Design a protein around this ligand. Structure first.
Ligand SMILES: Cc1cc2nc3c(=O)[nH]c(=O)nc-3n(C[C@H](O)[C@H](O)[C@H](O)COP(=O)(O)OP(=O)(O)OC[C@H]3O[C@@H](n4cnc5c(N)ncnc54)[C@H](O)[C@@H]3O)c2cc1C
Ligand SMILES: Cc1cc2nc3c(=O)[nH]c(=O)nc-3n(C[C@H](O)[C@H](O)[C@H](O)COP(=O)(O)OP(=O)(O)OC[C@H]3O[C@@H](n4cnc5c(N)ncnc54)[C@H](O)[C@@H]3O)c2cc1C
Lengths: 393, 393
């Protein structure tokens, strides 16, 4: 009984565990799955509960529900540290020893050292976090009617105009009429501001899609400030740099979607990391460790054709998990391992419940078609981990 | 030709207005109804939206929906002052001149000068105030899962154990299970604490009802501190006096149901007031103005028999409205009619969705009987102002 420990029941981890579960028969390996919570949250949907456009219970599933307690032992606790020499993982309430290790601890926010961002701005990275964002915004809107002078209650600043930020502002723009109606609020006073340091919205994207997104969101009232970095974050708003001079936006809500880095546990444990991530070998392993595998957002891979890194996505995390399960199963039975090859299909970014943009199959995809394609691809992961049973819920 | 101005579209005001509408045959009175908002809220229901057990729209009705624009002209503005000498009421956005004046501006909170109570505790007195309370609480619970050490997020202190405080804690007690389900909170950690300076819960009431209420609410986990004054209020809680010594409660939410005074506008306008209220003559008029009528909570009346002052209630306010409507109609048509005679029926205090207590007619009433009696009595008012249409909504 070799011991395989998987840290984090996110996309890569939960898929790795389920893969090992399907491939292996009882008493062949001792597998323990460690997670902060007893549920797995569907991270790619987290922007919707944050906005209030979807209930949060549709973005998570109970882990014990998914797995087999015989093949996999589930442990709900928080990983604190990793000791490679002792091959021991330190939790808040315990210790674990591993023969093989899988690290899938996801991302932490990258604030680029910007002042006050960690302390005063929100992140879309968990069920807890999006519930907090949602209730915070509803609270500010409730506060406005008693204090009509505080229009900063109705100002929401979204930092970063990448995939996440765009999806979020779209959800928000969809939500605004119902929210205003709910709190007796004048829609004309509401400001949703997306602030990006880069010269363009959605950098690295097809410019047609960017223009379409900017038109749709702008029509629904989103304001874009491009080429505008956030110099500072304060409890009453953000300070940005316009034309080389400081300007202030007074906003009761600031959400940071600007960047992600690998979870700090990986770097604190002495691994060599780039942006907190590990550039793994052909069999998704930490260099100079034949027993340590890295999946999801903790893993860095470079595209062969270009020379730019693959972005941290749920899709490639899923593929990471499948490959690691197959390779570990082979490794335990003394077989040989297959190298990892990413197979990246197109991805669609929603612009609300009804609209979206994407490049699918090399072809540009707008509107309801793109929206449905996204919904379908999302349904596939659900079928993958929980089957049609999960798909119905 | 004569102009009747009614200030405040609350119980007394809206009932006086609708009554005047029914009694007069148009074109005889110029009637203007002034309100802070474009809706009339059913104040006696406000404890439920505050807790979150009922949506706030069911606790208000559009004023324009209630009245006839031909007979009554509705003005949405905020009263700033009253000039008795010039017969002019000054608004934020206007001025009005009256031949007849009906004052029903309701109550304001009385904090008795307790430090921090005004700045840091919430009050149940409007649709805005209760939306703010509800969202504040939901926000604290949402914040809890991320910071489980902060149990004070789950502590709600309700100051004053009179009618309103009891109804409110009952509503909260009903609400806690769903709320806890919503934010992944362990119900055992939730503290609902009702703090009373008086030696008993529900002071001035029959002890049977008091004991039943404490038993029911105590059963749903509400905690009572009696004989306990509130020395101070801060953003993190309250300081109370126990056994003559200061003790601290760390609470993210403090709601004050401790006392009310007449709206300060009446006192500031040079009227002679007792605790901001006017002791009116037998035709509910302010001494010694023959053209000014006072309704609702702004009016103080003494019972002839018991020689005690009457409590500020919707029931007596409604009766005020009916009486001023009849008396003003008679006054216009030269009829010279009737003095005000209060006929006070029993009142029921709800203890949640399923339970309540009261002294109705002469009999103590508990449980489903009392609950239905209260619902029936409220529906009576709904029928009074809006008919079967309003009753169905
Ligand atoms: C709004 C938003 C929308 C997105 N949309 C898309 C999309 O459409 N397509 C796409 O490909 N990608 C999308 N992504 C990216 C995708 O969500 C991530 O790339 C993916 O979740 C990373 O997978 P992961 O398993 O590595 O990490 P995670 O999904 O974040 O899982 C990490 C797990 O480990 C737990 N955990 C974290 N730290 C600890 C710790 N110390 N101890 C114990 N447990 C811990 C966490 O609770 C969590 O369960 C989106 C991301 C966001 C925020
Ligand atoms: C939770 C709670 C529960 C209650 N339950 C009961 C019960 O069960 N039975 C009972 O008999 N009584 C009950 N009461 C008491 C009852 O609600 C009040 O006594 C009654 O509403 C007061 O009559 P009113 O019309 O003068 O005041 P209000 O109902 O408060 O109306 C005053 C109106 O004036 C408006 N207004 C105020 N100031 C201004 C301004 N400067 N300018 C313009 N407009 C203004 C306000 O918008 C409001 O519409 C309860 C009270 C509370 C807080």
């Amino acid at each position: 009984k070799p011991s395989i420990v998987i840290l984090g029941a996110g996309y890569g981890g939960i898929v790795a565990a389920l893969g090992l579960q399907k491939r292996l028969n009882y008493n062949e390996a001792d597998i323990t799955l460690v997670n902060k919570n007893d549920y797995h949250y569907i991270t790619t949907e987290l922007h919707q509960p944050a906005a209030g456009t979807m209930h949060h219970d549709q973005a998570r599933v109970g882990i014990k529900e998914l797995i087999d307690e015989k093949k996999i032992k589930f442990v709900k606790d928080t990983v604190v540290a990793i000791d490679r020499e002792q091959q021991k993982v330190t939790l808040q309430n315990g210790e674990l020893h591993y023969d093989y290790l899988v690290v899938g601890l996801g991302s932490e926010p990258e604030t680029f050292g910007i002042e006050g961002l960690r302390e005063h701005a929100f992140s879309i990275n968990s069920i807890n976090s999006v519930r907090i964002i949602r209730q915070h915004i509803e609270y500010q809107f409730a506060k406005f009617a008693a204090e009509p002078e505080r229009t900063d209650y109705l100002t929401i600043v979204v930092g970063g105009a990448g995939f996440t930020g765009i999806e979020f502002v779209g959800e928000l723009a969809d939500r605004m009429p119902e929210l205003c109606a709910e709190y007796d609020v004048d829609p004309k006073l509401v400001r949703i501001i997306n602030v990006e340091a880069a010269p363009t919205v959605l950098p690295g994207f097809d410019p047609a899609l960017v223009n379409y997104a900017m038109d749709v969101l702008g029509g629904k009232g989103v304001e874009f400030k491009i080429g505008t970095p956030i110099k500072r974050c304060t409890p009453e708003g953000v300070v940005i740099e316009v034309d080389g001079e400081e300007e202030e936006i007074k906003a009761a809500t600031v959400v940071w979607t600007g960047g992600v880095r690998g979870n700090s546990i990986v770097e604190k444990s002495g691994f060599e990391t780039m942006r907190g991530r590990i550039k793994v070998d052909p069999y998704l392993r930490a260099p100079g460790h034949e027993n340590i595998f890295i999946v999801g957002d903790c893993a860095l891979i470079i595209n062969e054709e270009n020379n730019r890194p693959y972005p941290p996505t749920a899709q490639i995390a899923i593929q990471h998990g499948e490959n690691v399960a197959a390779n570990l199963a082979a490794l335990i039975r003394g077989g040989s391992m297959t190298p990892f090859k990413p197979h990246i299909r197109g991805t669609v970014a929603s612009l609300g419940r009804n609209d979206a943009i994407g490049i699918v199959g090399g072809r540009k995809v707008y509107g309801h078609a793109a929206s449905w394609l996204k919904k379908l691809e999302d349904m596939r992961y659900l079928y993958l981990i929980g089957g049609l049973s999960l798909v119905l819920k």
